[PDB]
Amino acid sequence: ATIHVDGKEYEVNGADNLLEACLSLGLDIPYFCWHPALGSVGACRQCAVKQYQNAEDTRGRLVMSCMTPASDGTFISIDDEEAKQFRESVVEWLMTNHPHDCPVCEEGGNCHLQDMTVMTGHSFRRYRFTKRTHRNQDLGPFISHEMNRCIACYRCVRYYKDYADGTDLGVYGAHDNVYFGRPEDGTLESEFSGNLVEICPTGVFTDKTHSERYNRKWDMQFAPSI
C-alpha cells in the first residue's frame, strides 16, 4: 500500500491501521488506548490525524489513525494545525482531573501520559474548576492501585479480560466517574496481573515490590537477562 503523510510517500502494509503503520515508519502520533498486542478500539481519541480524500484536497477531516486502515493511496497529515490542536485538546481534557502527583508517583519518568502531554505541547492550564477524586483498592502484595491518575483509556480491562482472560478486574460507573479495579478489595487472581504496570499508561497500577525500594528509571542500571 502507498500512503502520503505530510506530502511524503511511504510504503506500508495495507492490512495495518494508520497508527501502527506510522509508528513503524518512525513518525510520532500520540496515543493512549491502542496497544500493539490488544488491537484498536478508538477510545481515548488521542491519535487524530487529518485525512484527505485525494492529493488535491485541502479541507480533509479528523480521523483516528488507529481505527483507519492504511490502505493504498491514503493521504493523511499528522502536523496539520487542526489535528495538532485537537490532540492538544485531548491531552488538556485528560489533564483537567489529573492529580498533582508526579513527584510522589512511581510512574514518573516512565509515564506514557507525561510523554504524550509533553509531545502534544500542552503545558498551560486554563481549567480552573475541581478535579474528580477516587478512593483506591487493595489489590494484593504485587500491584498498587491509585485511581486518581486514571485517564480512562481502558487498556487495563482490555488486557486483563480480553487478552489474559482474567475475571476479577473490570470497569464500573459511568460518564466521568468510570472506575477501573476489582469489585471488592482482594488480591488480583490472574497469574499475569503484573503486566498491568506496563500496560497502564499512568500510575494507577504500579509495582508495589519496586515501590518499597523506589527509584526512577533514569537512575537504574539495566542489563538484558533471562
Binding site: C102, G109, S123, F124, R125
Partner: protein
C-alpha cells in the same frame, strides 16, 4: 516568518556564484537554522572553492572557524552526503556582511583533508585542534601536532567512541610526566615545535611558564631569541583544556548552561547568551522584549566587569599597581547588582532556554542607578592617573602593531579588529537580543592596532556599555521573564507548583531533558574579548549531538607570533596584557 525558521539560503548570491563557477552538481546545499548558507563541497574541490571565495568582488576575508564532527552516531542526516566524519569551514565576508559554512564529508578510513593554511593562516591551529580531538589529518600542514592534549596521548577525545569521564588517577604516570617536564629542556629540539635554524649558534631558546598569573591562566611560550629580540615564538596551550565541548555531548540542553558560563570566566551571562540563543533557535522560541532587555543588561554589566579587569590588569602589567584595587571595587559594585539579580557573582548561570531563571527582584533599579552614578568619575580617574601617563604610553604605543589585513587573515575580532578601522561589531552588524533598540556607538581605531589603541578602544566600549545600561535602567519593559513556549525550560515556577500539565513539563524537562528536534543552529555574539559563537547540532535528543564553541582568544593567541616578531620580551608581556584573553577561552 520567524528568525529561527529552517532556511536553505538559496537566494544568497554566493550560491549563484558558486553554481556559475563550479556547476550545479559540484555541491549540496543543506537547510539549517544556522542563519548562514551551508554548502557541502567535495574534498578535491575545497582549495578551489576557498580561493574562489577569497577572490570574489566582495570577498570572504576571514576564516571564522574550522573544526570537525563525528557523524557516525547521527541518525537524522536526511539530505546530507554520506559521511563518517566531516570538517566545516565558517568564512565571513565583512563587506557583504555575510558568511558561508563549507562542509567536507570524510569516510572513516580516509580521514585526510587538504590543508587550508595557504588560504587562511589561522587554519594552522584550527587544523591542529581538529587533528588532536578527531584524528583528521591535514595534508600539507607545516607541523600537525596535538595542541590540546599532550603529545603522548592515546586517542582523539571528541570522537563518539572515546569515553568522556575522567580515568583513574595514577601516581606513576604523574611521576613519568614530571620526568618529561624535568628533561624537557635537556632534550629540547626546535624541529618538533616548527622552529628552525636554532642552536647559527647565536639564538637561544627560552621557555615561559606559570610565573605571571594576571588572571589569564597558565600557558607556555617558547621564544627563539637573538640576544634580546624575538625572532620566532610558538605558544604552548592546552594547559587549561576542560573538555567543554565533550561535556556538551554529556549534559542536557538545560544542564549545560553552567558549563557555558565557564568558557570565558570573566564573561558570565555574556557566555550564556549565544548558547541560549542557539538553543532557542533549535526550539523555535522567540523571547519577549523584557527577556531581551534583561539579557542585554546582564551582558553589558558583565562586559563592564570584564573590561574593568582587563584595563586594570593592563595597567598592572605596565607597572602601575594602584588602579587594580579601585577597579575591583567597581567590580564589587557590579557584583552587588549581579548577586542581587542572579544570586551569584562570577558564574550566574541565570539565562534559561526561553528566558531567565527569575524575574528581576524588587529594588534592582536602585543598585543599577548607584553603579551608574559611581562608575564615570572612577573611569576618568583611571584615565588621568594611568592611561595618560607617558611612561605607560611609551610602554604601550607602537607595541605589537598590526593593520586590517593582518587582523583579517588571523581571525582577530573585538577591539583588536576595530582598532584597525574595520567597523565590525556583532551587536550592530548582526543584531541579536534586541540590541537594535538601543542607542550606542561602536568605537573604531585609526587603522593601526597597538596595545595602547586596543586598551583605549576598550575604555570607549566601557563608556558605550554604560550608555546601554542607562537605557536599560530607564526603559525596562513590563511583561514576562519567560517565553510562553512549551520548550521554555524550566516552566514558570508558580504554575509548576500548582498546575499538573506544567508540573509534567517541568518534571520531564529537568530529568530526561527537553527534546530539541533534529537541526543545526548557530549564534554569533560580540563577547567581551571578541566574537564568540555557539554551533549546536541536535540529533533529536535531549542532549547536544555536537557543541562547537568558537572563542576569540584562540585566534588572538594564534596571532601572537606574527605580531610580536622582531620585538623584545617586554613588548611580549605588554602585548599579552593588551590582548584581553583568558586561557579558558583558548582551550575550552
Amino acid at each position: 516568518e520567524p528568525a529561527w525558521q529552517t532556511r536553505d539560503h538559496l537566494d544568497d548570491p554566493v550560491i549563484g556564484e558558486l553554481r556559475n563557477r563550479f556547476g550545479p552538481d559540484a555541491f549540496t546545499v543543506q537547510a539549517t537554522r544556522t542563519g548562514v548558507p551551508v554548502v557541502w563541497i567535495k574534498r578535491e574541490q575545497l582549495l578551489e572553492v576557498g580561493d574562489f571565495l577569497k577572490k570574489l568582488p566582495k570577498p570572504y576575508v576571514m576564516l571564522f572557524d574550522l573544526h570537525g564532527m563525528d557523524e557516525r552516531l547521527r541518525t537524522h542526516r536526511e539530505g546530507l552526503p554520506a559521511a563518517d566524519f566531516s570538517v566545516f569551514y565558517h568564512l565571513i565576508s565583512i563587506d557583504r556582511n555575510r558568511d558561508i559554512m563549507l562542509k567536507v564529508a570524510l569516510a572513516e578510513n580516509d580521514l585526510h583533508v587538504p590543508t587550508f593554511t595557504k588560504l587562511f593562516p589561522n587554519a594552522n591551529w584550527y587544523e591542529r585542534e581538529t587533528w588532536d580531538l578527531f584524528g583528521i589529518t591535514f595534508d600539507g600542514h607545516p607541523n600537525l601536532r596535538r595542541i590540546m592534549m599532550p603529545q603522548t596521548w592515546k586517542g582523539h577525545p571528541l570522537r563518539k567512541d572515546y569515553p568522556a569521564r575522567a580515568t583513574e588517577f595514577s601516581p606513576f604516570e604523574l611521576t613519568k610526566a614530571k620526568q618529561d617536564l624535568e628533561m624537557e629542556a635537556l632534550t629540547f629540539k626546535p624541529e618538533e615545535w616548527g622552529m628552525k635554524r636554532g642552536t647559527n649558534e647565536d639564538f637561544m631558546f627560552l621557555n615561559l611558564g606559570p610565573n605571571h598569573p594576571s588572571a589569564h591562566g597558565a600557558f607556555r611560550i617558547v621564544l627563539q631569541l637573538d640576544g634580546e629580540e624575538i625572532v620566532d615564538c610558538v605558544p604552548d596551550i592546552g594547559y587549561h583544556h576542560r573538555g567543554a565541548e565533550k561535556m556538551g555531548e554529556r549534559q542536557s540542553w538545560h544542564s549545560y548552561i553552567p558549563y557555558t558560563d565557564r568558557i570565558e570566566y570573566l564573561g558570565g551571562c555574556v557566555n550564556e547568551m549565544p548558547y541560549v540563543l542557539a538553543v532557542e533557535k533549535l526550539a523555535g522560541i522567540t523571547v519577549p522584549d523584557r527577556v531581551n532587555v534583561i539579557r542585554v543588561m546582564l551582558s553589558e554589566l558583565f562586559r563592564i566587569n570584564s573590561h574593568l579587569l582587563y584595563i586594570s590588569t593592563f595597567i598592572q602589567d605596565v607597572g602601575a599597581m594602584t588602579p587594580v584595587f579601585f577597579a575591583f571595587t567597581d567590580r564589587q559594585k557590579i557584583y552587588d547588582l549581579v548577586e542581587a539579580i542572579t544570586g551569584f557573582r562570577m558564574h550566574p548561570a541565570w539565562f534559561r532556554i526561553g528566558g531567565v531563571a527569575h524575574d528581576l527582584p524588587r529594588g534592582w533599579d536602585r543598585l543599577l542607578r548607584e553603579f551608574l552614578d559611581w562608575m564615570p568619575k572612577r573611569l576618568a580617574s583611571y584615565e588621568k592617573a594611568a592611561l595618560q601617563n607617558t611612561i605607560l604610553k611609551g610602554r604601550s604605543q607602537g607595541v605589537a602593531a598590526y593593520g586590517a589585513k593582518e587582523a583579517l587573515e588571523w581571525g582577530t575580532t573585538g577591539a583588536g579588529l576595530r582598532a584597525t578601522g574595520i567597523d565590525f561589531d556583532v551587536r550592530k552588524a548582526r543584531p541579536y537580543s534586541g540590541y537594535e533598540n538601543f542607542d550606542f556607538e561602536i568605537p573604531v581605531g585609526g587603522g593601526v592596532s597597538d596595545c595602547y589603541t586596543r586598551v583605549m578602544l576598550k575604555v570607549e566600549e566601557l563608556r558605550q556599555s554604560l550608555r546601554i545600561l542607562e537605557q536599560c535602567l530607564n526603559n525596562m519593559p513590563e511583561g514576562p521573564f519567560k517565553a510562553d513556549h512549551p520548550l521554555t525550560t524550566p516552566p514558570p515556577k508558580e504554575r509548576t507548583l500548582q498546575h499538573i500539565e506544567t508540573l509534567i513539563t517541568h518534571f520531564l524537562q529537568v530529568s530526561w531533558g527537553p527534546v530539541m528536534p533534529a537541526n543545526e543552529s548557530f549564534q554569533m555574539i560580540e563577547a567581551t574579548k571578541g566574537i564568540n559563537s555557539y554551533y549546536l547540532t541536535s540529533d533529536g535528543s535531549t542532549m547536544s549531538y555536537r557543541t562547537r564553541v568558537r572563542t576569540p582568544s584562540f585566534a588572538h593567541l594564534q596571532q601572537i607570533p606574527a605580531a610580536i616578531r622582531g620585538s623584545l620580551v617586554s613588548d611580549l608581556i605588554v602585548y599579552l596584557g593588551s590582548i584581553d584573553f583568558v586561557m579558558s577561552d583558548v582551550d575550552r
